[PDB]
């Protein structure tokens, strides 16, 4: 049995454009493990993030978390693109700063 991933994109802090914080795309509950995750800003992939080592949950379904330290603004939209093997088209999600 293969399990489509669960995707939650969010920030560490409530988003008010003023100072610096850190954002994270959290993907959990997927199987198998062939998971390709990218952080996108305004449609273009962010170059170098931190790809954490793979972690296993009690339900055989793995979970990964990608994150960056940056300063958010009010004129840019951010998103997370994931292309597991269970879905035929790469899914993209928008971070809702609200």
């Amino acid at each position: 049995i293969q399990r489509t991933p669960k995707i939650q994109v969010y920030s560490r802090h409530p988003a008010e454009n003023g100072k610096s914080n850190f954002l994270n795309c959290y993907v959990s509950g997927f199987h198998p493990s062939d998971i390709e995750v990218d952080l996108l800003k305004n449609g273009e992939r962010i170059e170098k993030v931190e790809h954490s080592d793979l972690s296993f949950s009690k339900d055989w379904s793995f979970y990964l978390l990608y994150y960056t330290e940056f300063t958010p603004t009010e004129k840019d939209e951010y998103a997370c693109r994931v292309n597991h093997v269970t879905l035929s088209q790469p899914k993209i999600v928008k971070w809702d700063r609200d």
């Binding site: 669960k6 995707i7 939650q8 994109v9 969010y10 998103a79 899914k91 993209i92 999600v93 928008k94 971070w95 809702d96």
Partner: peptide
């Protein structure tokens, strides 16, 4: 068949 829409958090 306008292909290209963005999802949200789950």
């Amino acid at each position: 068949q306008v292909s290209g829409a963005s999802f949200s958090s789950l």
